[PDB]
Design a protein around this ligand. Structure first.
Ligand SMILES: CCOC(=O)c1ccc2nc(N)sc2c1
Length: 238
């Protein structure tokens, strides 16, 4: 996350940290006790379950947070109509601990609700993104602390402009950005939550998916339009 501020898991009790062996991979969003939704592109190269470690209630990248839970990946469901721009960038991780249980709601652990089907906030709305991604594009390292910021929804017409992202953007993706392009998601923030308060309720509007650079003029971050995948989400979590 470029710019923004630092935070703790208490401000995104649903955000998940996914590792692999052990290095960070991507973020995730706990949408229910046993289910974490993230982005496919994050796992396509090592599509195997046995390698992933998921954490909930974790506020730091390489040190523990009092109260976090560690989970294995019972199942790694990747969308079948993927290419990557990146299409159907949506993944589902079934989580189970060595004790066999799913996630237990706590002060630093809670689930996030999905939107009403095909229902998205109007463009210009302020949503918040969360993650352990670079603070700057030249950084080699990722921040040790969890960060977050706010970005506004860009209409599909604006993001389609050849001088924006052209045809690469589809009705199934949302664009979001800072009017001055100073804050934004960056490498390391993929999969995680694009939360907007809609209808007066916090909802998972998108999943950090892709973008040309980080905080560059006319180059919004792109997010998987969650509201266009509920039957997929519903069927695959059954
Ligand atoms: C995880 C792969 O890292 C990137 O290369 C990368 C680059 C730009 C970008 N903009 C976003 N909203 S997510 C993102 C990821």
């Amino acid at each position: 996350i470029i710019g923004g501020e630092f935070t703790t898991i208490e401000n995104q009790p649903w955000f998940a940290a996914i590792y692999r062996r052990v290095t960070y991979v991507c973020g995730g969003s706990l949408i229910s006790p046993c289910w974490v939704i993230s982005a496919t592109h994050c796992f396509i190269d090592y599509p195997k379950k046995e390698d992933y470690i998921v954490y909930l209630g974790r506020s730091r990248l390489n040190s523990n947070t009092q109260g976090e839970m560690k989970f294995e990946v019972e199942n790694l469901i990747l969308h079948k109509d993927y290419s990557a721009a990146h299409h159907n960038d949506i993944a589902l991780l079934k989580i189970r601990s060595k004790e066999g249980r799913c996630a237990q709601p706590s002060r630093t652990i809670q689930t996030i609700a999905l939107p009403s089907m095909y229902n998205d906030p109007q463009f210009g709305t302020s949503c918040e993104i969360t993650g352990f991604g670079k603070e700057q594009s030249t950084d080699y390292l990722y921040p040790e602390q969890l960060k977050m910021t706010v970005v506004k929804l860009i209409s599909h017409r604006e993001c389609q402009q050849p001088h924006y992202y052209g045809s690469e953007v589809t009705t199934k993706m949302l664009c979001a950005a800072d009017p001055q392009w100073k804050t934004d998601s960056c490498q390391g923030d993929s999969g995680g939550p694009l939360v907007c308060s809609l209808q007066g309720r916090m909802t998972l509007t998108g999943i950090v998916s892709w973008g040309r650079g980080c905080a560059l003029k006319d180059k919004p971050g792109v997010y998987t339009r969650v509201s266009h995948f509920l039957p997929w989400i519903r069927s695959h979590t059954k």
